[PDB]
Design a binder for this molecule. Structure first.
Ligand SMILES: CCCCCCCCCCCCCCCCCC(=O)OC[C@H](COP(=O)([O-])OCC(O)COP(=O)([O-])OC[C@@H](COC(=O)CCCCCCCCCCCCCCCCC)OC(=O)CCCCCCCCCCCCCCCCC)OC(=O)CCCCCCCCCCCCCCCCC
Ligand SMILES: CCCCCCCCCCCCCCCCCC(=O)OC[C@H](COP(=O)([O-])OCC[N+](C)(C)C)OC(=O)CCCCCCCCCCCCCCCCC
Ligand SMILES: CCCCCCCC/C=C/CCCCCCCC(=O)OC[C@H](COP(=O)(O)OCCN)OC(=O)CCCCCCC/C=C/CCCCCCCC
Ligand SMILES: CCCCCCCC/C=C/CCCCCCCC(=O)OC[C@H](COP(=O)(O)OCCN)OC(=O)CCCCCCC/C=C/CCCCCCCC
Ligand code: HEM
Ligand code: HEM
Ligand SMILES: O=C1C(=C2CCC(c3ccc(Cl)cc3)CC2)C(O)=C(O)c2ccccc21
Ligand SMILES: O=C1C(O)=C([C@H]2CC[C@H](c3ccc(Cl)cc3)CC2)C(=O)c2ccccc21
Ligand SMILES: [Zn+2]
Lengths: 104, 54, 32, 81, 56, 378, 45, 55
């Protein structure tokens, strides 16, 4: 039903309003590094880790220079990669399992 | 006028003194701003690159 | 390997005091 | 503890810099800085300003109302005698 | 080649830290007096006729 | 090794403000802590001088200040500087708090809690200085603030009489105000050192809310000159306030000495307090009013607990930003209401502003954070 | 929290109840003795 | 230091302000004193090194 197109519309609006794409950043780059997120980052393979580090340094440099990327290079909503989500879900499952053991 | 003077004797000398030290504090702003800009130009023009073996 | 190295150009930022080149290098340094 | 020898692990990033005495301190103001400030104002205008406009309307209304309340009502003397 | 003003200024005065410091004390001695005199002149001039120094 | 690193005192200085790793990208909002410290130092110096001419006795306090401002050489400007420095101190304090609310730096729990302690201490200090001139406003301010403990149900009245040292406000209370006002600033100093000790174990947050360990620069020379620039600006403003327009923030009713038999028709505290006053005015019940008064500040301690967002900073969170600025306008509204008589329009407006303040902190922000999370699909 | 609902936590709380009310007795009697609180001390023979 | 031609009222308030503030400077310097001490540890009556019998 149409409701899918409608919700995706508002979601795209919110994404462009947030503006981390103007700095060349992915969504999974912008998470705060709590305990689980750090453990998920530990699990990444080397290529993803290095790409993430450079992207973040580049955003920091731009922010230092009160500037943004050219529009041609902004991250687009329809071709983004949630590279960290899978690892995070596993980390959280493991912690939940341990908790559940601890109450018996 | 006399009650004005009775309430605030430091009036004239205060304005006298304002001219001086305000001129000075106004002068010191652009100078220190220049010094800041000088020290920060190193970072403001920095260029990065990423070169993985791929 | 490395041999492909080249610093990108900084023309926009450099001082005119060295672009107006009619004076030995070290004397310029002194003026700046 | 935290010290410039072992903060994080990075690979394959190259940097380039000039010395301060080689370059200008205020290189391009009116050709680059001014438009940048303009867009920087544009990107935040509607997230900050309307709330303050509403505050201004509320303030003026409340002042006017309080000042009306202090004026004598003719019906308080004209109505019955 | 071009003996220019700021280069002479660097080489004679600013190259050595002690002499830089000496230059600074010498400059402040004279700046203080010149600056005071100018300010007092302006002030006196803004409100002639109203100060008791002259009414005396 | 260099001497910079040869010795514990020197090495602590070095880890504090020479080789400390700072974020490259922090903005002007991070200058206000150093300005706070500067203000504390200014206040202590000007206070130690004033102290040597003031009289903590109800039969000469007023006249001792007259003596200071008329006969002591340049005593008037020392007075002016003290009074205006307090105002600057609170301006910086408010801006300093607001930064941390916006950029999510409350997740540094120890620093945040020590900050709340410092806020409380500074307010106490400022108020106990405000009553020393023994003018007409000072007296009734004292009276109200010391009657506040009567609201404690079982032991309150006795606490009031034990703080007064008698049946009423009087000479024995003024010396207590003066001893406490003398000692508190130094406790503030010590706790500031603890505050920074806690900070330097983690380092500074930044505007983007992401980890900056890939782009740290040293504190010296960059932030040394930056903070010096900030200080120059603060001094320009302070001088213009002291010499060009000294009466801007001044109150005439405190140039009338104290009269225990008459409260003036129009009552108004110092500006940095108005908002609390408004809150206190808004509850038709004594105990409830005092409780609200104290909760208005104590509520900061549970902001870390109500945090739902995946991201730390509001830089990338627009709905959040909208609410933030609405909260700031509520506080402006309380400040404006505090200035007005206790009459009906302002009564009603103040009650709405108070309910919206607590509402916003406790309910609206958490829920908007959840909506935001759902819009980004996590 | 929701984590601390379960059997072990119930058992663990039961283990410490007595010590808890004993420390409560200590604090109450001490407060009273320290503030010469007549409301409690008038009942001590 | 007198604040006038002789000992008088202006001097007593100076005595009192200074007597109020000094003890706290003493406190801070005491902390520095002990900081310095704990880097080496205490000497003892015999004047020989006690690192074989520390408690
Ligand atoms: C008789 C008394 C005389 C007194 C004389 C006083 C003279 C004072 C001189 C001061 C000079 C300061 C120079 C500082 C240089 C520092 C350089 C630097 O690095 O700066 C970085 C710093 C910014 O830092 P940053 O790293 O970018 O980080 C900040 C943000 O994070 C960045 O985030 P962002 O990028 O998202 O933000 C973008 C945008 C965000 O934009 C927005 O949010 C939107 C704004 C829209 C505004 C639209 C217009 C207004 C609203 C209208 C709306 C419609 C109404 C409709 C009504 C309808 C009703 C029906 O913000 C800006 O760009 C702000 C720039 C302007 C800053 C202005 C600062 C004002 C200071 C005032 C001081 C007052 C006290 C003086 C002493 C008084 C003593 C009595 O500032 C600048 O870049 C600007 C520098 C230039 C500032 C000049 C200020 C001059 C003020 C003169 C005041 C004179 C009048 C006084 C009156 C007193 C009354 C009592
Ligand atoms: C706010 C004001 C009012 C406060 C009132 C306070 C009420 C509570 C008072 C309790 C006093 C007794 C507590 C004993 C706890 C012993 C714990 C312990 O480790 O003991 C074993 C330890 C070590 O013993 P040990 O090592 O030999 O062996 C212990 C081993 N077990 C337990 C197995 C036997 O003993 C001590 O060294 C304890 C010294 C305690 C000193 C307390 C001094 C009195 C201070 C409080 C009274 C004064 C209040 C003044 C109020 C004035 C108001 C106006
Ligand atoms: C009589 C009128 C007044 C006269 C005043 C004269 C003095 C004027 C001001 C002079 C300021 C000092 C300038 C010279 C400082 C030299 C410091 C020095 O040599 O020490 C550097 C070296 C640096 O350490 P490292 O990093 O380990 O070095 C390794 C290098 N690879 O040593 C140090 O650590 C610093 C030591 C500092 C010593 C400072 C001595 C100051 C003496 C001041 C005397 C003032 C007398 C005033 C008299 C007044 C009338 C009674
Ligand atoms: C003598 C009388 C004094 C009266 C009281 C004075 C203090 C109160 C002053 C209130 C007005 C303050 C206005 C400050 C300028 C606002 C400029 C603005 O809107 O800019 C938005 C711009 C947007 O930037 P970013 O989101 O980071 O992204 C840009 C990078 N791409 O900057 C910000 O949003 C930064 C906001 C930082 C916090 C500002 C806080 C201001 C108010 C603080 C004090 C309020 C009272 C106390 C609040 C806390 C109470 C518990
Ligand atoms: C006398 C009062 C205070 C002094 C002297 C003081 C001093 C400082 C200084 C110098 C810094 C260094 C970083 C900066 O300037 O931003 C700082 C950081 C900080 N202050 Fe305080 N502060 C005071 C009160 C407060 C209050 C009232 C709060 C909160 C309610 C607070 C919370 C913080 C936090 C969270 C940081 C670190 C945040 C970050 O780095 O992102 N402080 N303070
Ligand atoms: C955070 C630090 C301080 C703050 C916020 C503060 C604040 C104030 C304020 C608001 C006043 C009243 C101003 C007026 O009536 O015009 C005052 C007065 C006074 N303060 Fe301070 N003060 C501080 C530190 C000190 C210290 C350390 C001393 C040490 C003796 C001191 C001594 C005095 C004296 C003697 C007065 C009365 C003189 C007068 O009213 O002009 N103050 N203080
Ligand atoms: O200004 C400081 C700062 C400090 C600098 C020195 C200041 C200071 C104040 C008074 C004296 Cl007598 C000496 C130094 C205190 C604040 C400090 O510790 C930080 O960690 C920090 C981080 C980011 C941006 C600014 C700062
Ligand atoms: O009626 C009041 C009044 O209510 C307060 C109040 C303002 C808020 C103060 C306050 C107390 C605690 C905190 Cl955390 C903050 C502010 C307490 C005194 C005054 O300051 C005052 C001054 C002069 C005359 C009358 C009055
Ligand atoms: Zn003067």
């Amino acid at each position: 039903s149409a409701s899918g197109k409608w919700l995706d519309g508002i979601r795209k609006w919110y994404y462009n309003a947030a503006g981390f794409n103007k700095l060349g950043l992915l969504r999974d780059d912008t998470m705060y590094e709590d305990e689980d997120v750090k453990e998920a980052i530990r699990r990444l393979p080397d290529n993803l880790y290095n790409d993430r580090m450079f992207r973040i340094k580049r955003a920091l440099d731009l922010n230092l220079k009160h500037q943004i990327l050219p529009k041609e290079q902004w991250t687009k909503y329809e071709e983004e990669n949630f590279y960290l989500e899978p690892y995070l879900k596993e980390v959280i499952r493991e912690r939940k399992e341990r908790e559940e053991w601890a109450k018996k | 006028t006399f009650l004005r003077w009775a309430s605030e004797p430091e009036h004239d000398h205060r304005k006298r003194m304002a001219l001086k030290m305000l001129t000075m504090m106004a002068l010191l702003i652009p100078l220190t701003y220049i010094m800041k800009r000088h020290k920060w130009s190193v970072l403001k023009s920095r260029k990065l690159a990423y070169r993985p073996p791929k | 390997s490395h041999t492909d190295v080249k610093v990108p150009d900084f023309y926009d930022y450099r001082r005119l005091e060295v672009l107006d080149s009619t004076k030995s290098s070290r004397e310029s340094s002194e003026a700046r | 503890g935290r010290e410039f020898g072992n903060l994080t692990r990075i690979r394959h990033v190259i940097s380039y810099s000039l010395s301060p005495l080689e370059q200008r301190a205020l290189p391009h103001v009116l050709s680059k800085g001014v438009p940048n400030m303009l867009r920087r104002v544009r990107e935040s205008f509607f997230r900050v300003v309307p709330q303050f406009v509403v505050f201004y309307l509320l303030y003026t209304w409340g002042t006017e109302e309080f000042e009306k309340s202090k004026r004598k009502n003719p019906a308080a003397y004209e109505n019955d005698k | 080649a071009a003996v220019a003003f700021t280069s002479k200024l660097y080489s004679l005065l600013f190259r050595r830290t002690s002499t830089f410091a000496l230059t600074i004390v010498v400059g402040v001695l004279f700046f203080e007096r010149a600056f005071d005199q100018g300010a007092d002149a302006i002030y006196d001039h803004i409100n002639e006729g109203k100060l008791w120094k002259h009414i005396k | 090794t260099p001497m910079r690193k040869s010795n514990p005192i020197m090495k602590m200085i070095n880890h504090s403000l020479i080789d400390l790793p700072t974020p490259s990208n922090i903005s002007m909002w991070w200058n206000f802590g150093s300005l706070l410290a500067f203000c504390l130092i200014l206040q202590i110096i000007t206070g130690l001088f004033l102290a040597m001419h003031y009289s903590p006795d109800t039969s000469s306090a007023f006249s001792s200040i007259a003596h200071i401002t008329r006969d002591v050489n340049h005593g008037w400007i020392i007075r002016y500087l003290h009074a205006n420095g307090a105002s600057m101190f609170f301006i910086c304090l408010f801006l300093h708090v607001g930064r941390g609310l916006y950029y999510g730096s409350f997740l540094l729990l120890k620093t945040w809690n020590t900050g709340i302690m410092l806020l409380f201490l500074t307010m106490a200090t400022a108020f106990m200085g405000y009553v020393l001139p023994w003018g007409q406003m000072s007296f009734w301010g004292a009276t109200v603030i010391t009657n506040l403990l009567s609201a404690i149900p079982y032991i309150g009245t006795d606490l009031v009489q034990w703080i007064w040292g008698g049946y009423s406000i009087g000479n024995p209370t003024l010396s207590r105000f003066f001893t406490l006002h003398f000692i508190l600033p130094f406790i503030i100093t010590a706790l500031t050192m603890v505050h920074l000790l806690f900070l330097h174990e983690t380092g500074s947050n930044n505007p983007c809310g992401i980890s900056s360990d890939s782009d740290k620069i040293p504190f010296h020379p960059y932030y040394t000159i930056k903070d010096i620039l900030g200080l120059v600006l603060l001094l320009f403003i302070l001088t213009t306030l002291t010499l060009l327009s000294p009466n801007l923030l001044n109150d005439p009713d405190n140039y009338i000495p104290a009269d225990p038999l008459n409260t003036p028709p129009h009552i108004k505290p110092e500006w940095y307090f108005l908002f609390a006053y408004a809150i206190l005015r808004s509850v038709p019940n004594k105990l409830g009013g005092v409780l609200a008064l104290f909760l208005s500040i104590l509520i900061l301690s549970i902001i870390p607990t109500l945090h739902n967002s995946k991201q730390q900073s509001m830089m990338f969170r627009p709905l959040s930003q909208f609410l933030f600025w609405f909260l700031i306008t509520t506080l402006l509204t309380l400040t404006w209401i505090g200035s007005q008589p206790v009459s009906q329009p302002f009564i009603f407006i103040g009650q709405l502003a108070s309910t919206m303040y607590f509402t916003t902190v406790l309910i609206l922000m958490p829920l908007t954070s959840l909506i935001e999370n759902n819009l980004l699909k996590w | 929290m929701t984590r601390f609902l379960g059997p072990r936590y119930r058992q663990l709380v039961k283990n410490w109840i007595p010590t808890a009310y004993t420390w409560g007795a200590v604090g109450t009697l001490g407060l009273a003795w320290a503030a010469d609180w007549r409301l409690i001390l008038d009942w001590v023979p």
